[PDB]
């Protein structure tokens, strides 16, 4: 999951002029970290939903193979996986968008 941070870093890097027009409309320096990190953890959670979905697919897949082996749901582990996806999400998205918060609108606009 770590490289996703690199991905987002790239995406934001692409947004540099967009970052400048957003600061141009008076966005708070926090706000970019907000929206970006939220999008990142969003990806983490939707990927966690499709992920747990596929995991359940594997679960029934193992219901298909029952040499006495038995399925058993552990919902607490499910929610822990969710929160884990979340904390990894903030863990990855925090710093780069913090650096984005560091940025001046000026350089984000005038630069070519």
């Amino acid at each position: 999951g770590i490289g996703v941070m690199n991905i987002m870093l790239v995406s934001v890097t692409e947004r540099t002029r967009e970052i400048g027009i957003r600061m141009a409309v008076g966005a708070r320096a926090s706000d970019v970290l907000q929206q970006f990190l939220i999008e990142a953890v969003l990806v983490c959670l939707v990927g966690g939903a499709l992920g747990i979905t596929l995991s359940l697919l594997i679960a029934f897949t193992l219901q298909l193979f029952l040499p006495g082996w038995e399925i058993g749901f552990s919902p607490l582990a499910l929610l822990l996986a969710f929160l884990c996806s979340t904390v990894t999400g903030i863990l990855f998205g925090w710093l780069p968008a913090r650096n984005a918060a560091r940025l001046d609108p000026v350089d984000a606009l005038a630069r070519e």
Binding site: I2, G3, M5, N6, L9, V10
Partner: protein, 279 residues
């Protein structure tokens, strides 16, 4: 005698509404060496696309555009690129170049596709730079360079091929008439060098510099008034190109490589340790 180019009744057409439009119609043209031809005409007339024929970007599927007496229709597009190394040395208004390379490398590139020792062609390139009057600028990034000098780099870049044929997108339009028409005078020098050159412009004024204006409209001219060696050299030279591309993103490279490193290190880790406890 026979002109090195023979564009007779050649025309492109491209689909729109699932039918090809009249971007071009049958045109007769012939070209000698040392020609300095303007491409005057309305913008979007496909005279740019016609230049793409001159660039052999695509077969027109009409006429017989006989480069050196050889029609474009017969030869491979890769063979057309071989012709490009053999002849063509294109130059644009926007002076496109890698931000990556030093200007010497930006000139270095076309002959890389040729099979040749690097140092020799580097010396040739330095000769091309002194021909540009440029020397100190050699190590600079194009971003560090002034635009007219960058265009000069496009010229030397054309020159490394020998510049036997030269298309030219708006040579002077990106900048002042000073350095612009100056470079145009260098174009007159290459004309004096006898290599064929062909500027393209909708502007008559810059076209006045050319010895042969030719206006096109409605798809036709309204008038014509006068090796594995490079694979291993690819390995090391694009090794350097790789180092530079990584230099473009050292941090991204860092996260990427780390993503590799933790992986493989964990591989050998668990393999060896599990094997050892197993022992």
């Amino acid at each position: 005698m026979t002109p090195l180019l023979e564009l007779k009744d050649i025309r492109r057409s491209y689909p729109a509404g699932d039918e090809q439009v009249e971007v071009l119609k049958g045109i007769s043209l012939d070209i000698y060496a040392g020609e300095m031809v303007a491409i005057v005409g309305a913008s979007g007339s496909g005279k740019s696309t016609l230049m793409n024929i001159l660039g052999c970007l695509d077969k027109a599927t009409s006429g017989t555009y006989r480069v050196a007496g050889q029609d474009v229709a017969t030869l491979d597009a890769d063979a057309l690129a071989q012709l490009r190394r053999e002849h063509f040395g294109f130059i644009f208004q926007r002076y496109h170049l890698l931000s990556h390379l030093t200007a010497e490398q930006n000139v270095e590139v076309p002959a890389v596709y040729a099979g040749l020792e690097r140092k020799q062609r580097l010396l040739r390139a330095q000769e091309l730079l002194q021909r540009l009057g440029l020397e100190d600028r050699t190590e600079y990034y194009p971003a560090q360079l002034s635009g007219g000098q960058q265009q000069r780099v496009s010229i030397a870049r054309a020159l490394m091929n020998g510049g036997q044929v030269i298309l030219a997108d708006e040579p002077t339009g990106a900048l002042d008439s000073h350095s612009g028409e100056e470079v145009m005078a260098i174009l007159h020098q290459l004309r004096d060098r006898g290599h064929t050159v062909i500027i393209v412009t909708h502007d008559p004024q810059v076209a006045a510099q050319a010895e042969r204006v030719i206006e096109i409209r409605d798809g036709e001219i309204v008038r014509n008034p006068p090796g594995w060696r490079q694979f291993v050299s690819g390995f090391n030279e694009a090794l350097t190109m790789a180092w530079r591309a990584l230099a473009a993103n050292k941090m991204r490279t860092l996260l990427t490589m780390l993503g590799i490193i933790i992986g493989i290190a964990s591989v050998v880790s668990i393999v060896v340790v599990g094997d050892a406890a197993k022992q």
